[PDB]
Design a protein around this motif. Sequence first.
Motif, PDB file in Angstrom:
ATOM      1  N   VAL A 185       0.809  -1.199   0.000  1.00  0.00           N
ATOM      2  CA  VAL A 185       0.000   0.000   0.000  1.00  0.00           C
ATOM      3  C   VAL A 185       0.850   1.260   0.000  1.00  0.00           C
ATOM      4  O   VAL A 185       0.503   2.243  -0.618  1.00  0.00           O
ATOM      5  N   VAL A 186       1.955   1.250   0.703  1.00  0.00           N
ATOM      6  CA  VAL A 186       2.878   2.386   0.651  1.00  0.00           C
ATOM      7  C   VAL A 186       3.458   2.535  -0.749  1.00  0.00           C
ATOM      8  O   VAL A 186       3.637   3.652  -1.258  1.00  0.00           O
ATOM      9  N   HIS A 187       3.763   1.416  -1.399  1.00  0.00           N
ATOM     10  CA  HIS A 187       4.270   1.499  -2.763  1.00  0.00           C
ATOM     11  C   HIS A 187       3.262   2.173  -3.681  1.00  0.00           C
ATOM     12  O   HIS A 187       3.624   3.025  -4.503  1.00  0.00           O
ATOM     13  N   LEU A 235       1.063   4.352  -2.848  1.00  0.00           N
ATOM     14  CA  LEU A 235       1.052   5.783  -2.539  1.00  0.00           C
ATOM     15  C   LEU A 235       2.181   6.513  -3.258  1.00  0.00           C
ATOM     16  O   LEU A 235       1.969   7.575  -3.864  1.00  0.00           O
ATOM     17  N   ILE A 236       3.386   5.950  -3.220  1.00  0.00           N
ATOM     18  CA  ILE A 236       4.516   6.592  -3.891  1.00  0.00           C
ATOM     19  C   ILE A 236       4.252   6.695  -5.390  1.00  0.00           C
ATOM     20  O   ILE A 236       4.422   7.758  -6.007  1.00  0.00           O
ATOM     21  N   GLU A 237       3.827   5.588  -5.998  1.00  0.00           N
ATOM     22  CA  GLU A 237       3.555   5.605  -7.430  1.00  0.00           C
ATOM     23  C   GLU A 237       2.529   6.671  -7.777  1.00  0.00           C
ATOM     24  O   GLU A 237       2.659   7.365  -8.791  1.00  0.00           O
ATOM     25  N   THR A 256       3.220  20.220  -6.164  1.00  0.00           N
ATOM     26  CA  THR A 256       3.911  19.031  -5.687  1.00  0.00           C
ATOM     27  C   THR A 256       4.319  19.178  -4.230  1.00  0.00           C
ATOM     28  O   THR A 256       4.338  18.195  -3.482  1.00  0.00           O
ATOM     29  N   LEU A 257       4.682  20.394  -3.815  1.00  0.00           N
ATOM     30  CA  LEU A 257       5.068  20.626  -2.431  1.00  0.00           C
ATOM     31  C   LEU A 257       3.894  20.529  -1.475  1.00  0.00           C
ATOM     32  O   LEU A 257       4.106  20.459  -0.263  1.00  0.00           O
ATOM     33  N   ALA A 258       2.664  20.550  -1.987  1.00  0.00           N
ATOM     34  CA  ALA A 258       1.498  20.412  -1.135  1.00  0.00           C
ATOM     35  C   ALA A 258       1.303  18.981  -0.660  1.00  0.00           C
ATOM     36  O   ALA A 258       0.733  18.774   0.411  1.00  0.00           O
ATOM     37  N   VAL A 259       1.790  17.999  -1.409  1.00  0.00           N
ATOM     38  CA  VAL A 259       1.555  16.594  -1.092  1.00  0.00           C
ATOM     39  C   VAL A 259       2.151  16.264   0.273  1.00  0.00           C
ATOM     40  O   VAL A 259       1.439  15.731   1.132  1.00  0.00           O
ATOM     41  N   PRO A 260       3.429  16.569   0.532  1.00  0.00           N
ATOM     42  CA  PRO A 260       3.990  16.231   1.846  1.00  0.00           C
ATOM     43  C   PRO A 260       3.276  16.881   3.006  1.00  0.00           C
ATOM     44  O   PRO A 260       2.952  16.206   3.991  1.00  0.00           O
ATOM     45  N   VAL A 261       3.048  18.190   2.931  1.00  0.00           N
ATOM     46  CA  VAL A 261       2.484  18.900   4.070  1.00  0.00           C
ATOM     47  C   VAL A 261       1.132  18.309   4.424  1.00  0.00           C
ATOM     48  O   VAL A 261       0.847  18.018   5.591  1.00  0.00           O
ATOM     49  N   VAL A 262       0.296  18.073   3.417  1.00  0.00           N
ATOM     50  CA  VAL A 262      -1.037  17.550   3.688  1.00  0.00           C
ATOM     51  C   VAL A 262      -0.965  16.122   4.212  1.00  0.00           C
ATOM     52  O   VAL A 262      -1.626  15.783   5.197  1.00  0.00           O
ATOM     53  N   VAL A 263      -0.177  15.259   3.574  1.00  0.00           N
ATOM     54  CA  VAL A 263      -0.161  13.859   3.991  1.00  0.00           C
ATOM     55  C   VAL A 263       0.320  13.739   5.434  1.00  0.00           C
ATOM     56  O   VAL A 263      -0.306  13.068   6.270  1.00  0.00           O
ATOM     57  N   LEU A 264       1.431  14.404   5.752  1.00  0.00           N
ATOM     58  CA  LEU A 264       1.989  14.298   7.091  1.00  0.00           C
ATOM     59  C   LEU A 264       1.085  14.950   8.130  1.00  0.00           C
ATOM     60  O   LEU A 264       0.922  14.416   9.235  1.00  0.00           O
ATOM     61  N   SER A 297      -4.883   4.504  13.564  1.00  0.00           N
ATOM     62  CA  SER A 297      -3.577   3.914  13.331  1.00  0.00           C
ATOM     63  C   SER A 297      -3.282   3.883  11.838  1.00  0.00           C
ATOM     64  O   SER A 297      -4.067   4.345  11.015  1.00  0.00           O
ATOM     65  N   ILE A 298      -2.116   3.349  11.496  1.00  0.00           N
ATOM     66  CA  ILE A 298      -1.767   3.077  10.112  1.00  0.00           C
ATOM     67  C   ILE A 298      -2.202   1.651   9.817  1.00  0.00           C
ATOM     68  O   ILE A 298      -1.524   0.691  10.178  1.00  0.00           O
ATOM     69  N   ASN A 299      -3.322   1.535   9.124  1.00  0.00           N
ATOM     70  CA  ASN A 299      -3.831   0.273   8.617  1.00  0.00           C
ATOM     71  C   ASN A 299      -3.992   0.418   7.114  1.00  0.00           C
ATOM     72  O   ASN A 299      -3.669   1.438   6.532  1.00  0.00           O
ATOM     73  N   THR A 358      -6.773   3.356   6.254  1.00  0.00           N
ATOM     74  CA  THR A 358      -6.330   4.742   6.240  1.00  0.00           C
ATOM     75  C   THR A 358      -5.314   4.986   5.134  1.00  0.00           C
ATOM     76  O   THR A 358      -5.229   6.093   4.596  1.00  0.00           O
ATOM     77  N   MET A 359      -4.557   3.959   4.757  1.00  0.00           N
ATOM     78  CA  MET A 359      -3.602   4.103   3.670  1.00  0.00           C
ATOM     79  C   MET A 359      -4.301   4.119   2.317  1.00  0.00           C
ATOM     80  O   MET A 359      -3.927   4.897   1.431  1.00  0.00           O
ATOM     81  N   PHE A 360      -5.381   3.347   2.158  1.00  0.00           N
ATOM     82  CA  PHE A 360      -6.156   3.413   0.916  1.00  0.00           C
ATOM     83  C   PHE A 360      -6.740   4.807   0.897  1.00  0.00           C
ATOM     84  O   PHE A 360      -6.726   5.439  -0.132  1.00  0.00           O
TER      85      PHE A 360
END
Lengths: 192, 144, 240, 48, 468, 48
Positions: free
Chosen positions: C99-101, C103-105, C128-136, C148-150, C153-155
């Motif tokens: 699932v993390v893979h 997300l990166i793709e 593109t710089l918006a992706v990190p701030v929002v995700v984190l 949690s990270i399941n 929440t990752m989907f």
Amino acid sequence: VDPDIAQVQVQNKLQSATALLPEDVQRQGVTVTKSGASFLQVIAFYSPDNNLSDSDIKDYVNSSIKEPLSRVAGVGEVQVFGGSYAMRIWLDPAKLTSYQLTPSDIATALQAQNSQVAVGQLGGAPAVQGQVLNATVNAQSLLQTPEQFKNIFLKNTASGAEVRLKDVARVELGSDNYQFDSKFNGKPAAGL
Amino acid sequence: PGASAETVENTVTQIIEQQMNGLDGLRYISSNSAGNGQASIQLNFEQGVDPDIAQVQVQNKLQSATALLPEDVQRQGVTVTKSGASFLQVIAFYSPDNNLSDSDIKDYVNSSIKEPLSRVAGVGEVQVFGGSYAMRIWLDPAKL
Amino acid sequence: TPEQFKNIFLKNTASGAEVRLKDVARVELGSDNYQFDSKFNGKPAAGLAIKIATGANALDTAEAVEQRLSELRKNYPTGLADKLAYDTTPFIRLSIESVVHTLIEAVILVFIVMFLFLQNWRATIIPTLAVPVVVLGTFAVINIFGFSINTLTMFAMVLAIGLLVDDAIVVVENVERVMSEDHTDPVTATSRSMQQISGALVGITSVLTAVFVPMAFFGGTTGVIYRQFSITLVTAMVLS
Amino acid sequence: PGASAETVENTVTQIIEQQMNGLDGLRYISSNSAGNGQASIQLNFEQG
Amino acid sequence: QLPPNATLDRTGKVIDTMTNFFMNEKDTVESIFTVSGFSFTGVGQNAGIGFVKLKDWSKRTTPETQIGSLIQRGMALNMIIKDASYVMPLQLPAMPELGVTAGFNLQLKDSSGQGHEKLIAARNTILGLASQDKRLVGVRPNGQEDTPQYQINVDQAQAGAMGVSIAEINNTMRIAWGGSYINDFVDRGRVKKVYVQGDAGSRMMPEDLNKWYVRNNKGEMVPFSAFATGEWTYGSPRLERYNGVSSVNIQGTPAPGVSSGDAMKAMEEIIGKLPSMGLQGFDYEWTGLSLEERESGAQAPFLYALSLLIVFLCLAALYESWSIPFSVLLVVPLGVIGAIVLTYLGMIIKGDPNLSNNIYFQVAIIAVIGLSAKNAILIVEFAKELQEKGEDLLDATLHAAKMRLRPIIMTTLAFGFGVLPLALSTGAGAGSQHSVGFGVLGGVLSATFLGIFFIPVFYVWIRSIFKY
Amino acid sequence: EDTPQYQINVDQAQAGAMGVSIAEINNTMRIAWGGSYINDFVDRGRVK
Ligand SMILES: CCCCCCCCCCCCCCCCCC(=O)OC[C@H](COP(=O)(O)OCCN)OC(=O)CCCCCCCCCCCCCCCCC
């Protein structure tokens, strides 16, 4: 204070006590409850024409009615009135002494002769090599009817007669003394 | 002990079930009676019910229910547990070179490994396949 | 010892000889249970099955079991081995990795499509710089609430990535368009742009946020499944 | 009452300690068996 | 599962064959751990279980080594193995917590109180019908079958006449045949148990009841034969109740290419044929995972309705109108139609029954509703402003369409590539990923091709009927 | 409020002379006048 926690705490502290209670008390059962809510309604069961015995009505309600109503959507608790019957042995002192028998003799004979036997399995786990069959073995030993109690062998007379329970006691299915009878409009009835 | 499945159902399971009706968030009750004298009642609750509260309320109803049982039943003692039938892991213990015997392995697992692992954080229940050592007296009826 | 048990005294006979335990039975060391028979790969073996406790992280408990077992392993008898015969946690690890893979793709692909449209590199880096701030930030916030990270929440996050760049894409696009139509400084163009599109931004966020809100308020197992999506998606939309 | 520490251990302490698994949030257990016959078992739980 | 009254040896030999089969699958299986005498149905000598571990997923890449493939090769096993009742390879549920095995779980109740024999007859009818229904596989009872039992009748009359007490009979026969834990002894500093039981040679067959003696009140020994008989009977080992009603449990699997819901439907039709076969008053209940499935399917309509309503209301509040919200919700079906079309087509061409109306499809639908509404607001709010400025409805909406056609398309294609990796995922949770992925991608496409055309037309219609 | 009650007085000495134990007297009157629960049977699946 949470009523459920208060009840569980009280009945946990009860466990320490019971080993010090009288044995008779222990066999009757020590019960713990809490206040809770009141009756929504009380139902009554009866036969208009006295066609059915009060015992029959009590049996019918306890068997058929009591369980399914507990399972209705909103019901919290279901309580019957009228208790239940018991087997009762009434001694006669004259007859007891005529045979030189005591009350303790009757108690001992009653416990000795009404029992449940266990017999394990055929082919239990450490088994003889080549064992083919594995089966449950149940025994039927408890007395079922009142005539079986009437015939409980007590002792043998000098002339050879057979002294049974009927010779010194009156045997009848009676009531449980703890809970008394309830009557609806002046007639025997059972309520829920 | 000694009773048939039908006697068990009539005298134990039905009365415990009738008392268990009326718990707060109950979803369904599944039960069985066995010919070896054993009764099982399983209470499944609704989502969002506290398991600890469920357990204490079962105990609060069972306290009074126990007085209505046969005396033979009351003597054995009825037990209340919460768990899920599935398994998270299975560990195996074996001798690769046969230096250690099967009875040695089984006793060692029961004596040294089971209790500490069952106290590991997050573990609910531990089921063991293999028995520990015991003193067996095997009688001969004829000599008796 | 068994010899001792064998010697337990029973009675005396009429003649006077004594009967001991050996006289009527066979005494030995045996099992306390005879009703199971376990094998690992066709060879006799013992087994410990563990059942998890009523709402506990399976990965944590598996690691704890392994730590405890590793400590125990020091005092094993010679010739004792253990090995997991049935474990579910490897699959969990594998599905999280997958699932993390994805997300990166997804982030890469979104970058590519928008660079196709916003042909400038300066332009396309701004969304593109918006992706990190929002995700984190989303991770932080929902962690405050106990999520949690399941995989759910990752989907949800993967699903959010394409929707979380909307406001920014809109903002940049207007500025660039404005700078092309009127050739003015970026500051003036950006001020005019923000004056123009505020209502579009708020409408976009309003509908996207409102859509997922109702499912947070459903009961059952299905409600627990809904709530992961709802909370994650709603939090990201507001942050975006 | 009347017992030695050894008999206390054998007849009480291990019997009660063998049931003390499956508790939630448990950290450790300390026990002692005394020559006055008394058995102690102290169960320590996690914070919260 | 072995036939009734089977010993631990027969069960062990069946499991030996099962072990050989699995271990001979060198490319798929790594290890197997078996136990005789244990199953989830209960402890008993004619039950067994095996934990089979496959090789690492990376090692297994050929169609031949997929999990479904092995299940079939093993399902052949119960056909080949003669002594067993059944040997079923089974798979785990998607969320292992919610059940022990995958498949359907049904509870058949005797809701009219016709007795155990009638219920077993009805269950046998059901099993027979399910066997020949091509949408199902592995349908079986989950419990224990009626077995021969030995019954001992103790004569209380003769026992009392002979001087023997039934309580003493209980003690002797119980310890002799069943065994007893008496007290403890200490081994190497550990407290272990002492057991007394009759030796195996004296407790195997009903002849061996004649070996044991009871001591009467006079102190003499009288044989068990003197007061007890024994007979062979036929009865249920284990009686089940589901909600206060006598019941039996039936489990099974969807056939390959069949969905969980389709199998559940299949099962129900079969249950529906009972009244026409002379079996009346039997009802069923769908327990466990099946219960979870039915409940989830049921609440989708409320979820869709509530989501649509809340969006309608927020749009009304933000834009101080009623026409704009109706316009926007009017284009939702164009977005939704792609999701359904693509999921259905992918199912049929791929042959995958996991592309279905599951719970991940529901969240994808909600996401598509949101995308549809977003695309519409983008153009209508700009058109409304332009109309406030004093432009004609037609002119203003065409202008807004022209100006906002570029950001709409790029945001939609952003969302569409944002989910493309989910749809094209492979292994380790790819099923759910494809559900979400396929739904959102179909929605994106139909909204990008039909929706963009319908947004301006609905706006002009509504604002022409309700002017100003 | 209080009510009248009746008291039995057993002469340990007279019983000794008569050769009857105290425990026998107590059991006799316990069972005869007080009653006793012995054990139960199942009458049609009902415990009585
Ligand atoms: C370019 C193509 C796309 C590349 C992908 C990233 C795009 C941006 C999105 C960033 C957010 C990444 C979110 C990752 C979620 C991982 C969820 C998870 O499963 O947790 C794993 C791990 C925690 O668990 P554990 O494995 O036990 O590790 C603890 C000990 N390390 O988690 C951790 O240990 C910590 C992980 C931290 C994640 C760091 C992300 C930093 C992003 C920095 C962007 C910088 C932008 C440029 C700024 C400079 C100026 C322009």
